[PDB]
Symmetry: D2
Subunit: 319 residues, 4 copies
């Protein structure tokens, strides 16, 4: 139980049961990836990507890593780079919450921002450019097979072990790099063919099911393209989810269950409740909670939330 490195605490996250949000004749369990030291499921690929690189001789002590940090991946790489002795450089838009900025500089990352109006790929480009220019290492979160690999061996094993001999009918997840859905899905389809793998997409960005994509707010989900690490054959059910319904459900999870997660976590739970609403008696669902809601205080997850005293509420108590 004594741990050598903080990176040894990655994975083995808890799966907990929702106490009141689910229909009584149903059971909805949830996987909290905020328990990872990085506060998100990205701790998995970041650690896997780097360990795979080292064993491949692509990374050496003191080396430098660079990637296009949309948010969590940057924080996880920064943490892993810091913990293993690497330098980390991430490229994020000029217009990106100053918090997602301070977080990276916290782990000692050297940040370089470009005009946000460059549609993301601008950094994704200056990533490989600055990479070969100095022989820097690129994670390639979207194409590095170590990503779905770590999920096959850890995430899936954790889910499989927890539900062994027990009932499980639905596994719900959204996708960004698609590593989670791919890895867990491949393991599930073989081990539990009966479990329906449910993949959700933001209502406006139904890339997979309609080739359409529009800037959404369900952070960490549906990027402007389809990752090559994806194995869509694993998907049993492809659905959509409104960013507002997802934001609202994330808020409910917090106030009604005490589980403070982000938007994509609200989306998965929303989809689960949806299926549960009309599901047969005794249906068991599992939803993925990708990260902590703590890094969302400055996003639409907190839009319309009172900041002052609850005078009105106090007043309603004496009348």
């Amino acid at each position: 139980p004594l741990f050598n490195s903080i990176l040894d605490t990655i994975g083995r996250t808890p799966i907990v049961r929702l106490q009141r949000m689910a229909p009584e004749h149903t059971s909805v369990y949830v996987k909290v990836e905020s328990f990872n030291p990085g506060g998100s499921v990205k701790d998995r690929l970041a650690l896997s990507v780097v360990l795979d690189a080292e064993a491949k001789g692509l990374l050496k002590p003191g080396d430098t890593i660079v990637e296009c940090t949309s948010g969590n991946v940057g924080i996880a790489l920064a943490m892993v780079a810091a913990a293993r002795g690497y330098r980390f450089v991430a490229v994020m838009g000029d217009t990106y919450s100053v918090e997602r900025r301070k977080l990276i500089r916290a782990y000692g990352g050297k940040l370089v921002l470009f005009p946000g109006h460059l549609g993301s790929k601008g950094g994704n480009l200056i990533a490989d450019e600055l990479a070969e220019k100095y022989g820097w290492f690129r994670a390639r979160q979207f194409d590095n097979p170590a990503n779905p690999s770590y999920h096959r061996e850890t995430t899936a094993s954790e889910i499989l072990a927890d539900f062994a001999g027990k009932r499980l009918d639905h596994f719900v997840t959204g996708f960004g790099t698609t590593g989670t859905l791919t890895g867990v899905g491949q393991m599930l389809r073989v081990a539990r063919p009966e479990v329906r793998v449910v993949a959700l997409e933001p209502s406006n960005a139904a890339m997979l099911a309609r080739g359409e994509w529009s800037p959404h707010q369900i952070q960490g989900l549906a990027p402007n393209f389809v990752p090559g690490v994806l194995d869509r054959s694993v998907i049993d059910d492809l659905v959509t989810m409104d960013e507002v319904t997802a934001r609202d459900t994330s808020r409910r999870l917090a106030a009604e269950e005490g589980i403070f997660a982000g938007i994509s976590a609200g989306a998965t739970v929303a989809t689960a409740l949806s299926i549960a609403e009309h599901a047969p008696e005794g249906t068991v669902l599992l939803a993925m909670l990708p990260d902590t809601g703590e890094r969302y205080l400055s996003t639409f997850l907190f839009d319309g939330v009172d900041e002052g005293s609850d005078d009105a509420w106090l007043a309603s108590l004496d009348t």
Copy 2:
């Protein structure tokens, strides 16, 4: 295995070894309490007080809990209340950060603001008042024995079990409600008398060493009084730490080890290091890391932290 409630994940936090921040002739271990669902050590006292009130029959379903808080205690109580189905009311000054407000509200907590300058003792009167006026339950983080009690049964147990049959010389911690220092200290006193219980406090608030308190920046540490839940006899070495040193140490922990923790965590690691410097060869130290640094962005933890790219360093060669 599956967990029934999110509250069943509280505690059993990891103790990790610092990989490079400590003198090669020493081993410095760190207990990362940010792994608690609530992000801080307070998850323990929050759970303990509620489970305790329920057993004594002081908390029935749908009841509401009130507490004058400003930091992690309010977040923890709110989370626990949200998970147990209780209503929670946080009484805090308006001078306190807004982010702190959003956290308590995220968990469905009710906010009751009051003039900051009024100070703790002021808001405590407010909480006491509401509590009586409406018959709500008061946590009393500074006097509730269930607070240190839970550290004796969990925190201490985790430390003892991880170090069983292994060397351990110093256990370093600061104190707010002192629940951690008192509880773990009482168990170590019986199990490992050789371990020095090092209790640190802010220099400009060496409230115990020299009975002097004054606004410091090590959030969570040394209140302006002496908690009734404390047992001073447990302390072996009473020292002081500087907020700037604590702050820097914290920035190092994050950048050099990959462990992003609060300022009070920087303080303990700092004292642990100071002891490590001029210490026997092979000595082993354990320092408490109270919370996650993620809720310290609007703090002097990021005084002059670059908020924009540094294309200056971008060309060196």
Copy 3:
């Protein structure tokens, strides 16, 4: 944390590294299934079979479970029966140790014996008669998909999780029901196709290699037929092991590493060492340790072990 039933402790067994028995340029790990409450890997299929039957509505507390056994399955089933409120009847050949009899009885199980030479084929036939005659539930460990299924979900997950991000090159295991080999093997294929599935059989019972069988002494291994649960496609290297090398390797493990396991475990460890001897630097192997050697005392495992004092040694 607290456990509700003893059955909730099944699985999640430890994998330990051999300290001195393996070639220095190599790493041999071992999965100790004796940590299961029932003392062997059989606790996995016994729990899984019963839980599946319950879900299917085929088993109801108070019902009677019957199964042909070589020893371990009987103990496991008997233990689970005692834990869930079921009656258990074991069909075993007299050939097996009376200490395997007391163990099944200790859990309150009932014992029905038949001529040892009939083998698993004969007992299965007997278990079946009794099943029809009394409406008893048949576990059918060689055909019940719940057997390999539980290994995919647990054993495999434990192995995959333990080695995530680490080097693993070989996985060695013998087979009886073939649940472990099939379950772990099929999941190894999906997650780590490179790893080589090494499947051993007793030299005198190469039912797969040469379709031959003959009463052997590596308990738990090679029945007189090919289990229907089996999926041969999972095996990369099919090898043989002599019972004496097995027996002696199990002794070495106990005396040189502090790990006291059975004979089949001696076999898998021997096979792993052999491979490791001529394997490239850094090769990592994992051997399955089916059970505790504590139930092999009155067995050839303790053939001629000095039951008397070695005053001679004291002479010096």
Copy 4:
């Protein structure tokens, strides 16, 4: 995660709830020490005694450990030495179970038999002589502070952690070296002063009550002398248990709960049930289960076994 050595799996044993043996108005939990690699709670003192000697410099590579044992201490010390690479020498009566010897032999331990009668302090001095004569290490289980220490740091910690924020009214345990009673009791007294520590003694061996000893059949308990490691200030209730009632409770535990433990385990559970019968509603008890019942196959725990075939029973 992967374990470096087999010794790294010592401790952290599960606490499980009895399903049908306890009065419904009550809850009886049980700590199963048989989950230790060595099969008993002695794994804790054995490891602790060695790491302490090593740190103190009293043990160096190749050094040899000797101790007079016929029970679990020998087995535990035997395994530890085998994993640590020390030599182990056991001193026991030649009239003892040929299996108890086999166990020590399995772990590569040397055997020096001696007159059964002179058992007690005799075989001990024979080890005492060998100790100074050859410069060998003596554990001193009954007086070594490291025994209770390890219990205060692991056993007690596992109990306190599992019951944190939950009800716990009674802790029941017997004593041999008294290391468990002392260790768990000292930590219990500090964190949970209201939990009543119940120490039982065999009916004919009430050493603490009136200093009277007599040979009994509850293996592991009541030596013929009050151990120096004992702390009487932690005992709330001193009770006695009849060895037959213990033996029978052990049988019940296995057959009714699926938990196979030794005689002393039957004894503690017997005491817990007794306390539970007339205890207020909601009372929670925890009882220590010292070892596996698997090494009691040649003891009275198995008298009237009926090792044949349940042909008679089959008739109906």
